[PDB]
């Protein structure tokens, strides 16, 4: 379990969320703001609210409802 913070860029955040009950990470843009986050990381906390019981729409909303997002993964 790790805590990482990333700011938006000229090409968005720089990662892709997948899953429903267990929301996690699929690909990271090789030149985004996440590559320079690992491929295959489960998001367990987002923006203060734990996304253990969150829907995909809820996680996406949480990450997107703000300028910068700060989250807690599990690798």
């Amino acid at each position: 379990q790790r805590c990482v913070i990333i700011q938006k860029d000229q090409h968005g955040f720089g990662f892709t969320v997948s899953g429903d009950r267990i929301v996690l990470v699929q690909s990271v843009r090789p030149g985004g703001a996440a590559m320079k986050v690992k491929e295959g990381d489960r998001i367990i906390k987002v923006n203060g609210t734990m996304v253990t019981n969150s829907s995909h729409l809820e996680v996406v909303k949480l990450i997107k409802s703000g300028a910068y997002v700060a989250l807690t993964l599990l690798g």
Binding site: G12, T16, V17, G19, G40, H56, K64, G75
Partner: protein, 504 residues
């Protein structure tokens, strides 16, 4: 001569036909639906899911974790095991390895439980269904050789004695059957013979009954018209028309304006004034039938029993006597050695073990479901009688009712055959681990490529998906699985194969 199903068809019917989402579920269908813009990645991850399943620690932890969870129906056990059989068809020695492990563990948990003679009688675990599939696999070529013969003969015989007499379409109760519960209580009828013309044009004679419903009659015709054609290609009686042309004109339908109501009565041949020698035409384009909702029963059951006695007997004499299959020898001797290592003294515990292992787990299933190996479709009426024979067959293996009344001296006669069969296998020359691994190898090499591997893999993946936490934790607990970092690998694989996706 004997219509034996292909390997893939046989296996699919044996494994998945009585599964969760029905007879046309995912795997017989191959109904994998994913976008083609994802197929490369999805396959790429499914292969790593395969390599993961090939890790022993991962597979065992997976299985244990799944067995732990209460929310796991019997369906789930059976289906899962069958998926595991299909996905691991590649290295069957590894499969057999897993089975050995789980069977040893089950055995040792059973010996110091309450009753070790209860082993392999609950079907409440995965490794039992695994063993079931193992016997099914290894005995395919034995079925296609000598086993299928008197079994097909038996089926066709029962079917003949059934269709020789009246059958009710509503309640599925026939005048001729081995089942007391499925026996029809006394309507007059007649063995009619009608002339049917098929247009695709040829004229074919067909034997039916005047009390048969129009649907039943259609079935009896189609059965003769499309014999040369597999059952999957046969048309249902609801996509075929039957006409009667007397002079210069009437259409035959199960229910019509001519139906006799008071409750509706399904139309029969004796309803349309259709007597013998008539000419019918087949063009490919509440409710009661016979009954409106004892010694005769004993007599009918006994006569039917007498007619089928020959075929039942031939079947048992081929089954319980001959060159006993290598996997049977190997597994029974494995039960011997593991019974010696597990200090179970009682011989009837081993007789019960071998009984639960081979005749119950394999022969009974086929006896009740012939349509798993033969290109036939069977109705409940025949399957019921075959089930009576299956009960009879099981009682011939128990070292301890209409199936009890019907076959009396039979069971006793067959018990000697069974005990001498097991003894024959024990006094038989040992098939080493190598010979067995080789026989498995020829199967693996011959049949994996026709098998539906990706769908199996994906279903199993869904099983890991449902219990992701418990499994990842099971892998983090086990030191070997955290050494191989199997949790991280499973996490990555899960990461790739996901459905709903969003780019942020």
């Amino acid at each position: 001569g004997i219509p034996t199903l292909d390997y893939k068809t046989y296996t699919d019917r044996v494994f998945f036909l009585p599964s969760k989402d029905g007879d046309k579920d995912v795997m017989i269908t191959g109904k994998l639906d994913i976008p083609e813009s994802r197929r490369p990645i999805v396959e790429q991850a499914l292969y790593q899911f395969s390599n993961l399943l090939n890790s022993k620690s991962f597979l065992i932890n997976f299985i244990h974790t799944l067995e732990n969870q209460r929310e796991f129906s019997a369906r789930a056990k059976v289906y899962f095991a069958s998926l595991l059989t299909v996905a691991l068809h590649g290295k069957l020695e590894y499969y057999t390895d897993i089975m050995r492990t789980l069977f040893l563990e089950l055995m040792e948990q059973y010996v110091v439980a309450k009753n070790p003679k209860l082993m392999l009688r609950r079907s409440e675990t995965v490794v039992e269904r695994m063993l079931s599939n193992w016997m099914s696999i290894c005995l395919y070529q034995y079925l296609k050789d000598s086993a299928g013969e008197p079994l097909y003969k038996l089926f066709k015989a029962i079917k003949h004695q059934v269709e020789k007499g009246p059958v009710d379409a509503v309640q599925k109760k026939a005048k001729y059957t081995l089942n007391d519960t499925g026996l029809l209580g006394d309507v007059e009828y007649a063995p009619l013979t009608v002339s049917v013309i098929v247009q695709d044009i040829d004229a074919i004679p067909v034997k039916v009954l005047n009390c048969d419903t129009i649907s039943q009659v259609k079935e009896k015709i189609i059965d003769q018209v499309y014999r040369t054609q597999p059952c999957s290609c046969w048309p249902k009686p609801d996509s075929v028309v039957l006409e009667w042309r007397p002079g210069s004109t009437q259409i035959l339908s199960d229910l019509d304006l001519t139906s006799q109501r008071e409750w509706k009565r399904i139309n029969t041949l004796m309803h349309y004034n259709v007597r013998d020698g008539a000419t019918l035409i087949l063009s490919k384009v509440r409710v009661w039938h016979l009954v409106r909702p004892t010694e005769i029963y004993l007599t009918r059951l006994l006569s039917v029993k007498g007619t089928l006695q020959q075929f039942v007997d031939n079947f048992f004499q081929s089954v319980l006597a001959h060159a006993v299959p290598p996997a049977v020898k190997y597994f029974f001797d494995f039960l011997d050695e593991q019974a010696e290592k597990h200090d179970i003294r009682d011989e009837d515990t081993i007789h019960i073990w071998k009984t639960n292992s081979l005749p119950l787990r394999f022969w009974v299933n086929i006896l009740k479901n012939p349509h798993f190996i033969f290109d036939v479709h069977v109705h409940e009426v025949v399957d019921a009688s075959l089930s009576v024979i299956a009960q009879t067959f099981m009682d011939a293996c128990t070292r301890t009712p209409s199936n009890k009344l019907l076959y009396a001296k039979e069971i006793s006669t067959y018990k000697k055959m069974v005990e001498d069969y097991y003894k024959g296998i024990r006094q038989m020359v040992q098939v080493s681990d190598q010979d067995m691994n080789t026989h498995l190898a020829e199967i693996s090499r011959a049949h994996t490529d026709s098998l539906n591997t990706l769908v199996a893999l994906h279903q199993l993946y869904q099983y890991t998906q449902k219990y992701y936490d418990e499994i990842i934790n099971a892998l983090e607990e086990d030191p070997a699985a955290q050494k191989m970092q199997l949790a991280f690998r499973l996490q990555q694989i899960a990461a790739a194969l996901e459905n709903k996706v969003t780019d942020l």
